Design a protein around this ligand. Structure first.
Ligand SMILES: CN[C@H]1CC[C@@H](c2ccc(Cl)c(Cl)c2)c2ccccc21
Ligand SMILES: CC(C)C[C@H](N)C(=O)O
Ligand code: NA
Ligand code: NA
Length: 509
């Protein structure tokens, strides 16, 4: 089996798994939509009660599986629980990251396309005061790039440049993945993560220097870091906070598991898992939190920045921020640095959610790395045409896989590992080879608090929030549902073929 070459390489690869578009795009919107500082209390609590324990659990499951030559959940769930239903539940650890990759790589491709155009100065020119007259050219720039519907039909028409850039983006992901774990993912992480850190710090400093008649960057930080204790009774803020915690730490995606399956049997995962998690949070709350929100608040004020965040998932990062930057000397180049930052952040993450499918094909169907990588990319590339051409297909995939899917799968993986496999066996497995030990209290958090926390969340989620969606959406949602259900059945069939290939080999050997 492939293994991580160095300790630092492992940490940076895992940090690259976690530190992505979620830190710089998702977090600021989620925080601003939910009261800034009011979002942060449930966010911190979710990190301590969910983020941390599940990170350790997933590293542990991965290392355990990898020792026996298995990096993905269909096999790993079965090793922990010898039941046919374990294999089927394990399919979600291939389905979730695959579906997520299908739109995530597309969003990542926009950041590359924007980086190129901003570098070359092929950007909108606003008039040389009126906020609408500045923002509109940038809105139109994004809308023409992805091809937002101009009529009634839910049809997207991406520009030719956007389509070619998606192809280049797929190629770049392949070029890293094809070289493998140590010489591909690990080697790239060692270059990408320092670059990402430096670019982000530079942007934080530049943003901190922003002052207008409407406010300062400090007003943005005060908005994000001032608690509101009245919002603690609102379940929506809690649901948002936990959803971000899962997304940002790559939990419930089978991705941490697969990466950890290349950690050697003896090698620590307690300190390594905690460091990767802590590096992500710093990149999220300190770096991601200090760019978009403070800049928007400085130029528009709090109320207008909140409205901007509520307008959509991509307004703040793809429209508002570059528009703000264009009002400063060298602002176009600053836009480039922002989008290059986003691209490297996305790239280190997208390779992480393509690796589970790669590992499955290698581990279970015995494909070569080359064939496993090329077939995974072919599936992601083909499937992304749905996200590229059908309006709100991205939304539907992100709802089922990237939102509901991960929380369900987090609860599922915990029950299988910490309840069925055995709490004391799981606790032993986590701590084995640890440089530091997991604090004793976390045994009771993992066994009782975390599963109860997630179960209550999922019940309130399903009853008081999601029936409003399943009924009040456009009929075209069924196209995406139909296709991603098909992918699940496709992956179930491959799991079937893998266990039949095992029987043929077990009969021969
Ligand atoms: C629950 N889904 C929401 C919030 C997350 C948000 C989202 C999802 C994935 C990513 Cl990568 C980002 Cl940056 C942001 C989004 C995007 C488009 C449509 C809907 C949504
Ligand atoms: C799907 C995951 C790889 C996402 C990543 N953790 C991010 O924050 O962008
Ligand atoms: Na990343
Ligand atoms: Na993240």
């Amino acid at each position: 089996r492939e293994h991580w070459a160095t300790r630092l390489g492992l940490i940076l690869a895992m940090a690259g798994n976690a530190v992505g578009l979620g830190n710089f795009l998702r977090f600021p919107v989620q925080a601003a939509e939910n009261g800034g500082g009011a979002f942060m209390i449930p966010y911190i609590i979710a990190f301590l009660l969910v983020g941390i324990p599940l990170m350790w659990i997933e590293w542990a499951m991965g290392r355990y599986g990898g020792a026996q030559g298995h990096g993905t959940t269909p096999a790993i769930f079965y090793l922990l629980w010898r039941n046919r239903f374990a294999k089927i539940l394990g399919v979600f650890g291939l389905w979730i990251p695959l579906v997520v990759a299908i739109y995530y790589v597309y969003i990542e491709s926009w950041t590359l396309g924007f980086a190129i155009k901003f570098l070359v100065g092929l950007v909108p020119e606003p008039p040389p005061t009126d906020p609408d007259s500045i923002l509109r050219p940038f809105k139109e720039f994004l809308y023409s790039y992805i091809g937002v519907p101009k009529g009634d039909e839910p049809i997207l028409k991406p520009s030719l440049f956007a389509y070619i850039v998606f192809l280049i983006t797929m190629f770049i992901n392949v070029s890293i993945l094809i070289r493998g774990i140590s010489k591909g993912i690990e080697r790239f992480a060692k270059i990408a993560m320092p670059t990402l850190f430096i670019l982000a710090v530079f942007l934080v400093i530049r943003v901190f220097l922003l002052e207008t008649p409407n406010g300062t960057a400090a007003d943005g930080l005060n908005f994000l870091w001032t608690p509101d204790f009245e919002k603690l009774k609102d379940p929506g803020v809690w649901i948002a906070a936990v959803g971000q915690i899962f997304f940002t730490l790559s939990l419930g995606f089978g991705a941490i598991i697969t990466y950890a399956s290349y950690v050697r049997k003896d090698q620590d995962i307690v300190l390594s898992g905690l460091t990767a998690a802590t590096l992500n949070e710093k990149a999220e709350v300190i770096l991601g939190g200090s760019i978009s929100i403070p800049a928007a608040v400085a130029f528009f004020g709090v109320a207008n920045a909140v409205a901007i965040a509520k307008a959509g998932a991509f307004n703040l990062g793809f429209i508002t921020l570059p528009a703000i930057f264009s009002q400063t000397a060298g602002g176009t180049f600053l836009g480039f640095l922002w989008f290059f930052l986003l691209f490297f952040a996305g790239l280190t993450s997208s390779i992480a959610i393509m690796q589970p499918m790669i590992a499955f094909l290698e581990d279970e169907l015995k494909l070569s790395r080359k064939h496993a990588v090329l077939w995974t990319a072919a599936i992601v590339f083909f499937s992304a045409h749905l996200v590229m051409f059908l309006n709100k297909s991205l939304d539907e995939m992100d709802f089922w896989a990237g939102t509901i899917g991960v929380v369900f799968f987090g609860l599922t993986e915990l029950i299988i590992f910490f309840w069925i496999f055995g709490a004391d066996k799981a606790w032993e497995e986590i701590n084995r080879g640890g440089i530091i030990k997991v604090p004793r209290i976390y045994y009771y958090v993992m066994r009782y608090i975390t599963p109860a926390f997630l179960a209550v969340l999922l019940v309130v989620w399903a009853r008081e929030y999601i029936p409003k969606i399943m009924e009040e959406t456009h009929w075209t949602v069924w196209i995406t549902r139909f296709y991603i259900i098909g992918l699940f059945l496709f992956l179930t069939f491959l799991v079937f073929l893998a266990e039949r290939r095992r029987n043929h080999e077990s009969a021969g050997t």
